[PDB]
Write a protein that binds this DNA or RNA. Structure first.
Length: 1122
RNA sequence: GACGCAUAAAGAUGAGACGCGUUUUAGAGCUAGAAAUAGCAAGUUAAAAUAAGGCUAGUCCGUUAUCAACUUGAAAAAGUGGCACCGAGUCGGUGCUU
DNA sequence: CTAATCGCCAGCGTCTCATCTAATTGCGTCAGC
DNA sequence: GCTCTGGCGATTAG
């Protein structure tokens, strides 16, 4: 007996079929186990498996990072307390305790209920003097009197905890930048640097610069309007750098210095001055103007007598808010009394009371209040403010996302420099506080673990706790920046032990250029066939036409080389379009940088180069590059080092160094490069050298050279296709096992992926898994593995009237797999099947094995939102001591699996034990506690005298079978899902597909009237379809109300055309599809869903255990338990 | 079938940081009143938590992938279910055979 | 003191750095013959 | 040669 397997792979399904030799599906008699009353089930060999798609590991990553940002921040404050503790032991020895316990309710506090002062009068006075924290910060910055230590700590902690962003490097001075009339100093500097009496346009001032946007479309208009220049730099060649930075890196005018090379504000300025000193300013005022623009974009109050602009801006905002509020209140009271209580007392709307106490944002408040004041009188200023987002604003909003940290730090400095006079400790350890504020872990060091994390790579120099003060004396920076890169680069395919070489490297470029050049097929009149060049000619031509220029075309090789002879016009070439795809770029760059010849041509020096290009590829910071290059300082001049350290390379190659240079034969003593250079009159390239038996370069690879999951998990692609592939691999294995341990003859695969290599990998995996019997001479193909496109099956489907609709049932996966197998087997035989009646019989079969994979749930504990306190038993505590009846908490957890527990429980007024049997919900949070010791766990839950052996665990999608062939799957401890299929006969499906798509052609225009005539003489199929649906829904669905609503809805619309009627009959199958109930739409009526919330009807049913294929089964009669 | 150079649109993993949002508490409400109530005044901020927690005690870990039942085995992992013919409402009927 | 109904709710925006994959073009190779 | 779908708080009725 010989058979064949057909498969169809997807993201949420897989379909399998087995055909013997005539496109016929066999049938067999399998046996069942358990305490039931069955012994044999007759099953057909075709079906599908259904699961739910996997998901990427990105979201989890984000959560992890967020965690790491709350562990460090809480430390950032604790350090500060360590510096204040002793001093704070003298003023109030309970300040920190109250700050810690402020969250608890009034009764759980073991101290006073006022955090700061411990009094009522002092607290009220403090809140009255400083309405906000910004008043306190500005007062501490600007005043000169002795303050209280508590206020200093509060201000410092508020600045340390919220510390701005780190996107700008350098120094920023708000005092010298808030004055935006500096442009006159720019004009006078421009006049003094270039004496030609420049002209300018009067009318453009600081405010016009303020309104300018980052988009160059408005920037060009601003620059042409502000000054009509006299030269290229005047128009836009220089002012762009002054306004924002020299973003272009190409010469706009020769007069800048020589060319244009400056960039924006980063760590490059300290070297970019080398561009200007050679051509000695506007470059100093450019920074001031750019800083002025970028700082006045966010700050309104310019500095006159204050060193704190941010606090002044916030105070001004607060005062304007108060004034606008009182004016609006008075006017609204005077002109529209009826709306008053609607806007200032109701929290359920978007009024002012819903803006402060409710949950509305600025946009909703403005959109709700604009029409209210639109029809009023005396609302011009408020209306114009509402269009600029300045009406009744708050201090802490989203717009604060663009505050640099260099602002915050500035204020901190001031707050110390005064109060250090009265407190010696502040002067003693000011630098500690600054370092606490402005310390960040570099992105190339990562976590600071001690070998217990699978994410870290850091290497230490000693053994001691790591703090911001002794960071650079415990951790190692070069050894960490090296491992940050060495843990991601590829290995050499030929030898899986060596690291690859950087893409730009002298050895690698030599290999590439010689490999390309050695196969030149030059032809001449005298020599009719393409010969191969000799070693000395290559050695001459490489330096003649490669070490002097980087780019060479065909003309250069045809003319320049043959100048010594007369055959320059008689040599023709082939295999090159117009140039060579190789160059000695690194050689030319090092020649320009070093300006020396012998150091590059000498072989003995190449080792040094092998490091000079290595570091320039690994590191990215200037400091570490300089530290590594310090070793070779004496080799070149200081100017040479300064110009060299500005060169950066990226990328990596694919061939290591041990293979290109370092391995040689024992009978020749030459390396691959040597042979490729001087093979002789007949030359061979890398591919011919490596795959050669005359020299011992083959066996070296063989002597230089595993579970399934760890090999699957290394493919490239989305995890969904990986899940599908892993399922298919096991489906094939079980199918092989079932039918007598005889391997198939063909396997036909078809992929279907959406957002020609994954198919080649799956085919490789299956072929390597199947072909094991290895011959001894050379290689045997016991089985084949065919690959098929998706067009052929679709054409065979749409040509012979084998239509399909996906809304009826889940039977189309198996039919697709069967058709794939049939078409492939037929097609690989001739180098359109026969007896189509067999195909129709197979596709009209009522028995197909559809199984849904059972799974235990994983994920988050419960819903992420925190709910207000209320008296209920569904609230989950947030910490252990926070009782949800006083602080709120989470609700609606997620269950992992359920358990069938049978035992006694006290009940009734008599307080007596009664036998009971119920399900239970073991949440994700409680899984470990149950699995560690179940008996105690569910004895503390209420039950007692529990039988140990009768406990059964039921994952999601467990299958129960009830009376009259009614199947329900399980979804939770208190909900069920439908589990049956509808097997509609083929003729109804064929008619129903043709009725739809009525207005659009399906084939030739001359062969379409027959389909119409068919639909008019078979119009009366709709009643039969409705009767079929009604009978099925009466037998297995039990949805009488929805069914008799659907019946009336259909009966009311019998006069509509056929197209709409059929297109809406298609919509009615949502009532009978398995899975979760869903709401569908008829013509105009809407039908709501019916959900099964009672799970007590499956405790007397039969529990079915199923295999992945679905043919092996186990049945348990639950009526005998108890 | 696989390997080394010449290409412009998407993804897939890991690291370092900002700005909001939500819960509880603090910021003394007044007057007419027997009562349920009514009239007025105020509103912009701060503290703590941000998966319950763990031991290996780190300025570290805790939402990805894997998962029918029974027998052996801590785990790794290994094993367990007859064949032909006629038919078709979720699979039946007949004949050999352990 | 439980079973059939109808209805409402679910955390979200942004910035820097590094390493891998891959479909088609033309280049010359092996695998084989 | 060449190859979306479970939880939760209300309603009236057996």
């Amino acid at each position: 007996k010989k058979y064949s397997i057909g498969l169809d792979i997807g993201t949420n399904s897989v379909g399998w079929a087995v055909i013997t030799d005539e496109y016929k599906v066999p049938s067999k008699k399998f046996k069942v186990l358990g305490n039931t009353d069955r012994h044999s089930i007759k099953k057909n060999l075709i079906g599908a498996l259904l699961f739910d798609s996997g998901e990427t590991a990105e979201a989890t990553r984000l959560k992890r990072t967020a965690r790491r940002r709350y562990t460090r921040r809480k430390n950032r404050i604790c350090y500060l307390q360590e510096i204040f503790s002793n001093e704070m032991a003298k003023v109030d020895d309970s300040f920190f305790h109250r700050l810690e316990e402020s969250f608890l309710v009034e009764e759980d506090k073991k101290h006073e209920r006022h955090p700061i002062f411990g009094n009522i009068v002092d607290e009220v006075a403090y809140h009255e003097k400083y309405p906000t924290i910004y008043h306190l910060r500005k007062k501490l910055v600007d005043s000169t009197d002795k303050a209280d230590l508590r206020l200093i700590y509060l201000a410092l902690a508020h600045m340390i905890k919220f510390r701005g962003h780190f996107l700008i490097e350098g120094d920023l001075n708000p005092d010298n930048s808030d004055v935006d009339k500096l442009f006159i100093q720019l004009v006078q500097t421009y006049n003094q640097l270039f004496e030609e009496n420049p002209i300018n346009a009067s009318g453009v001032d600081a405010k016009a610069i303020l309104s300018a946007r980052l988009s160059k479309s408005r920037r060009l208009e601003n620059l042409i309007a502000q000054l009509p220049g006299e030269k290229k730099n005047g128009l836009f060649g220089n002012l762009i750098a002054l306004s924002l930075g020299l973003t272009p890196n190409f010469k706009s005018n020769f007069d800048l210095a020589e060319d244009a090379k400056l960039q924006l504000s980063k760590d490059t300025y300290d070297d970019d001055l080398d561009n200007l000193l050679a051509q000695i300013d506007l470059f100093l005022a450019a920074k001031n103007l750019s800083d002025a623009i970028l700082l006045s974009d966010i700050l309104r109050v310019n500095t006159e007598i204050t060193k704190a602009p941010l606090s002044a801006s916030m105070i001004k905002r607060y005062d304007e808010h108060h004034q606008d509020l009182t004016l609006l209140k008075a006017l609204v009271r005077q002109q529209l009394p009826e709306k008053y209580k609607e806007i200032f007392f109701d929290q359920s709307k978007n009024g002012y009371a819903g803006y402060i106490d409710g949950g509305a944002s600025q946009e909703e408040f403005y959109k709700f209040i604009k029409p209210i004041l639109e029809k009023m009188d005396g609302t011009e200023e408020l209306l114009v403010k509402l269009n600029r987002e300045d009406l009744l604003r708050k201090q802490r909003t989203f717009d604060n996302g663009s505050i640099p940290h260099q602002i915050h730090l500035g204020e901190l400095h001031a707050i110390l420099r005064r109060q250090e006079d009265f407190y010696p400790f502040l002067k003693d350890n000011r630098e500690k506080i600054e370092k606490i504020l402005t310390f960040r872990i570099p992105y190339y060091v990562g976590p600071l673990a001690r070998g217990n994390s699978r994410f870290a790579w850091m290497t230490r120099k000693s053994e001691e706790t790591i703090t911001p003060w002794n960071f650079e004396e415990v951790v190692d920076k070069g050894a960490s920046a090296q491992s940050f890169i060495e843990r991601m680069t590829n290995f050499d395919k030929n030898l899986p032990n060596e690291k690859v070489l950087p893409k730009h490297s002298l050895l690698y470029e030599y290999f590439t250029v010689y490999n390309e050049l050695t196969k030149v097929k030059y032809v001449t009149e005298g020599m009719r066939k393409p010969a191969f060049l000799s070693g000395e000619q290559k050695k001459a031509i490489v330096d003649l036409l490669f070490k002097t220029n980087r780019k060479v075309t065909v003309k250069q090789l045809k003319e320049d080389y043959f100048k010594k002879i007369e055959c320059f016009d008689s040599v023709e070439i082939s295999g090159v379009e117009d140039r060579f795809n190789a160059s000695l770029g690194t050689y030319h760059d090092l020649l320009k940088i070093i300006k020396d010849k012998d150091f590059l041509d000498n072989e003995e020096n190449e080792d040094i180069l092998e490091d000079i290009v290595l570091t320039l590829t690994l590191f990215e910071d200037r400091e570490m590059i300089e530290e590594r290059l310090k070793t070779y300082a004496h080799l070149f001049d200081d100017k040479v080092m300064k110009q060299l350290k500005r060169r950066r390379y990226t990328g990596w190659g694919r061939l290591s160094r041990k293979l290109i240079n370092g391995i040689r034969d024992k009978q020749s003593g030459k390396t691959i490069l040597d042979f490729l250079k001087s093979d002789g009159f007949a030359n061979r390239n890398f591919m011919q050298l490596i795959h050669d038996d005359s020299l011992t370069f083959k066996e070296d690879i063989q002597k230089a050279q595993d579970s399934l999951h760890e090999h699957i998990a290394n493919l490239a692609g989305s995890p969904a296709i990986k899940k599908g592939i892993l399922q298919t691999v096991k489906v094939v294995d079980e199918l092989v096992k079932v039918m007598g341990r005889h391997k198939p003859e063909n396997i036909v695969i078809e992929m279907a992926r959406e957002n020609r290599q994954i198919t080649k990998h799956v085919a490789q995996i299956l072929d390597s898994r199947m072909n094991t019997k290895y011959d001894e001479n050379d290689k045997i193909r016991e089985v084949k593995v065919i690959t098929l496109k998706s067009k052929l099956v679709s054409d065979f489907r749409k040509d012979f009237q084998f239509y399909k609709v996906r809304e009826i049932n889940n039977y189309h996966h198996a039919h697709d797999a069967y058709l794939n197998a049939v078409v492939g087997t037929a097609l690989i035989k001739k180098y359109k099947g026969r007896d189509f009646a067999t195909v129709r019989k197979v596709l009209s079969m009522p028995q197909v094995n559809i199984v849904k994979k059972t799974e235990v749930q994983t994920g988050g504990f419960s819903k992420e939102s925190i709910l207000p306190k209320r008296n209920s038993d569904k609230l989950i505590a947030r910490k252990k001591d926070w009782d949800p009846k006083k602080y709120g908490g989470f609700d609606s957890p997620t269950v992992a699996y359920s358990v069938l527990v049978v035992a006694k429980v006290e009940k009734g007024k008599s307080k007596k034990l009664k036998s009971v049997k119920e399900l239970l919900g073991i949440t994700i949070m409680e899984r470990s506690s149950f699995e560690k010791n179940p008996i105690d766990f569910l004895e503390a839950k209420g039950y007692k005298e529990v039988k140990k052996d009768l406990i059964i665990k039921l994952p999601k999608y467990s299958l129960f079978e009830l009376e009259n062939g009614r199947k329900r799957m399980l979804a939770s401890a208190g909900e069920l899902q439908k589990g049956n299929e509808l097997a509609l006969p083929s003729k109804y499906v064929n008619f129903l597909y043709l009725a739809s798509h009525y207005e659009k052609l399906k084939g030739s225009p001359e062969d379409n009237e027959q389909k119409q005539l068919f639909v008019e003489q078979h119009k009366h199929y709709l009643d039969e379809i409705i009767e079929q649906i009604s009978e099925f829904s009466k037998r297995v669905i039990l949805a009488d109300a929805n069914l008799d609503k659907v019946l009336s809805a259909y009966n009311k619309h019998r006069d509509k055309p056929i197209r709409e009627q059929a297109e809406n009959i298609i919509h009615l199958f949502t009532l009978t599809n398995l899975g979760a109930p869903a709401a569908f739409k008829y013509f105009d009526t809407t039908i709501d869903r019916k959900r099964y919330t009672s799970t007590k009807e499956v405790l007397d049913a039969t529990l079915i255990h199923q295999s992945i294929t679905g043919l092996y089964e186990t049945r348990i009669d639950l009526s005998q338990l108890g």
